[PDB]
Design a protein. Sequence first.
Length: 250
Amino acid sequence: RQWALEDFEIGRPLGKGKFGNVYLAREKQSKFILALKVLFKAQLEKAGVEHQLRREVEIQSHLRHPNILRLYGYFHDATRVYLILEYAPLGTVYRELQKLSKFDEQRTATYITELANALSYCHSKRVIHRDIKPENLLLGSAGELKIADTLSGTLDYLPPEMIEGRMHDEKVDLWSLGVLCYEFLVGKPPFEANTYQETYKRISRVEFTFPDFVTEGARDLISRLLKHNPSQRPMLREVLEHPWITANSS
Ligand SMILES: COCCOc1ccc(Nc2ncc(Cl)c(NC3CC3)n2)cc1
């Protein structure tokens, strides 16, 4: 079964995004509340992402999980493309991260625990994320996490394998998991530069430092999650189980 724009009431705008926007919405028959993404053809077919759209849509469509934002369906109108998403009633993780300095140890750890379950499961559907970052980590009405998937974007997030030219198997997500578990605890991603240029130089060689206020326990996890050669990085089992993790993961 498919859908149409008239089926929904286009309420208030949630985020003034990239390819268009995302709005609050409700299906009339069902009275079901959700988020709706209006993005134009004339937008994606004008950087080239025309195919790579309908691509990851289905990649997502068959997928279901509690720390993964569901897609409920999709469709197109006169001009544009529409994405019928889960609604995450507590906004972006970013929204929270800015409004606070950083996250307290307990909170960070639970956000990582959840991101494991969701990737550990996601690694068994033969799907990898590249750029999972907190512009798109959302919170459910119970306050817990929900992933919502030379010039490109900031790359504080992509591993050295994604920019040296090397191969990128399924242990990408461990890099990202470290980078984030850092950001959550420190305030900035650990490869912040004001030029793309150092950022590149600083990732390839793994160049970062920890403020005083970081437990040796965190530095321990982060350190062994941020390794140049993907080989030496743990399976996501070792992670969920890691000492510092399960000490304060609510
Ligand atoms: C003081 O600021 C008020 C907070 O405003 C909110 C913004 C966003 C949500 N949740 C939300 N749910 C689902 C999606 Cl798909 C989505 N998309 C995000 C925009 C990319 N955002 C809730 C509240």
